[PDB]
Symmetry: D4
Subunit: 138 residues, 8 copies
């Protein structure tokens, strides 16, 4: 049987919350996501739709959900909607969204690598519990 | 598709190794294992064989390997052999054995709860890479 | 192949119904559920939403369905709705709901352990066949 | 996810052991196996090898192990060896063999229905833990 | 890998259609279904709902679809609706319904064995392609 | 759930054995195998090793065991060894080998299509029960 | 674990696009599909519905989607709608439809082999991304 | 059902062999492997054992086999043994080893990126059919 890490991640999340706090762990998770973004990378794309397809394939390779990218031309900003985020335990704000900084760092690396190449990710916090909305503005 | 946490655990292990060190993370993993031992517990058993069967069933519930308990009557000690440890990344001493303190804390809780009830676990470090030997002496 | 226990449970349910009756088996199933509640426990939670999120994870660990907790503030009561109950045979009132006292005991243990800690479970009998409604009042 | 009944069967076995005893439950399990033998039946066979093949197919239909029949011509007896019995908990004599009377009743029904048709089952208790040997004598 | 018999059944159906005809094969399939009804039987039930619940479990044991029984009290008839029939090839009237006499014989045996015990099955031929309606009148 | 045809094939084999005999069904199975050989074909190969590699891929596409081809240069004959033949029921000579004429026709078509192109298959009857040996001589 | 060829196909598609162009690869894919159509063929059918059923069974054998055939009697043309095309990378016009000439050649071979036997396939380019419409006119 | 690309790869391999030759396709496959090595990369390692563990994890992520690295200190060379190569068709020298240049380029990229960083891969052609031996010398 393939090992299951859900209970281990729940206990680790509770222990990290009780130990360091709710602000250092965000930076730690962002760094973890940035490091994860180095192992798997998308090919260089020229249009938003191709980038969306490649990122969806990369996410389906590991099964962490689906992504939707939109380009707001009012200020040339990027809106990213992530669906079916994995749920571990009941920690985070709101409860169940504990792996959001990981997505922030991962998407920042993936988009800045190619779209454009000078942006910063800021999480925007009736959407479902597992839906994460982020903005990519210069 | 069920989410896969292997790459996330590898990156997290590397980051934790680079940040805190190789001694604080051992205590953190021991605390994580002790907390994990509270969520699932075996029923109170009277003999070593029944304890072995119950612990094997509990391990197979999550798929973290197999266990073998044997009692040394020379000093009434307990020897625990764990097989098929999950492997994440290449961190630990030796490489690949990163989740050993978790097993130490888990087995300590499981055995001390019931055999006897006053023991301490100390890791004993041509056995395979994924085989861990621990001792339970008063 | 993993063993299948459905036919065995159907035959056992029929035999137990034919032997002891329809009132002793309810107490037996309640005791079985109370004993099951000792093997797996949820972490201590402070709010109803966190309790729901944890109980859903424990239920999904074994695949026995889904739970929904709600609080009536009129008399500070708790309403629990369980969905996708396992079906074995055609025994019970109504037919197919044979494992309801098990849920009663399990939920009583899980909630009383932490919400509050002084409550009793009483089954409330156009809802589907596999949906069970229970009340937790002092 | 398909429901898992392993923990439920372990708790039920412990409760039944603590409630009635270790002799009434044997008769209950024999009756359960006899009732189980009525739901699934093998076709009428004329030779021992065909009976073995049909019983192996029937067992593989549910995944309860493998069977081997051999005829002792000294007293026209039948020896049955069952392998890979399902293991639930740590109850029974020896530990892990809790569903042996079920096999006794099931095999008695299956063979007596057709080989011959006048025999009784008596369990014969360095074989493995999950191997059960039974004898069919008139 | 578990063997696949779909192509073999398609070729066999074509050959049987080309050899004997479209009337002898119906009797052959009815006899095959009647023989199949002996290997697996439902427990004796007293009401229509319990019979439906037991037959649904029996069908799900092999995965041949779902059944729905309803009693017309005008002439004390029984109407059976079968859904999700297996499809092999493109033979039968209409195309794809090649295993209908098997269901006729199987349901006749299953119902007549217990509801009542004196009935005959006659196939009633905007329903989907895989839906079969049968009547059970004395 | 994918439908299971094992019990249906067992009942059909028994009925066909009881109805026509043990010689007409062999011709029927040979014709069925010859028709099956038309749906799936191997690419034209020049050497025996390439033919073996292709035939193994086609067999694994449906999971009907494995094949091994040898060329005896004493009289330019071909020896074919088939392993892991599917087992249905207990019919055939010997018991358990009911789909051997299907293999005869299938291999005849597959080899004669390309090796050479003028041969006839004749079954050669301490090898296991599911191993079939055939010869391909002009 | 069964090998995964998705990333290999993505890289191969990108390299082929960068090397030969966007017109030679179409002929290459058409030839590949025509060669694929030789390995697996449907049985000769007389009506459109039977052809549709057989082609759907053949497609489900490999899992490449679903097909729908409909005959325009105005000019005796055939319209083919293919659903759930496999997606590899982000190449093709539109992005994601890289295996369309393969379907063109495959369907041309399959239909022309039997409906009628003199037709040519021409791709017709608010339908979804993975839906392909083709026409079969003389 | 997840799409299967085995038949497509076999037909594509045959067509590429028939069109360009047996020398241009080697360069094409090497370029494909080099491009594949960019999508997934191992973390920078300092010792051979850690590199072996990381490469094995990366290979198991896609299921393309296992790797074994060993350093000859006579001339500081590196020997790489790959096991369980995927098999498509019967093309290549020897038959079945069609994807060897892909592994050559992939391993060259993976090792040269970090061990050392100045090496070239040259394939060394009673080992099994799917085992490939490569050398990494400056």
């Amino acid at each position: 049987k393939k090992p299951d890490f859900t209970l281990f991640l729940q206990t680790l999340s509770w222990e990290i919350d009780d130990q360091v706090g709710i602000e250092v762990r965000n930076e730690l998770l962002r760094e973890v996501g940035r490091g994860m973004g180095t192992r798997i990378m998308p090919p260089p794309c020229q249009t938003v739709d191709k980038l969306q397809i490649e990122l969806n394939a990369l996410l389906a390779l590991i099964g962490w959900g689906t992504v939707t990218l939109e380009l707001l031309s009012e200020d040339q900003s990027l809106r990213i909607v992530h669906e079916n985020l994995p749920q571990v335990g009941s920690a985070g704000e709101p409860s169940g969204t504990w792996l959001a900084p990981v997505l922030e760092g991962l998407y920042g690396r993936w988009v800045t690598s190619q779209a454009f190449g000078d942006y910063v990710v800021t999480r925007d916090v009736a959407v479902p519990r597992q839906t994460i909305i982020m903005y990519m503005r210069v």
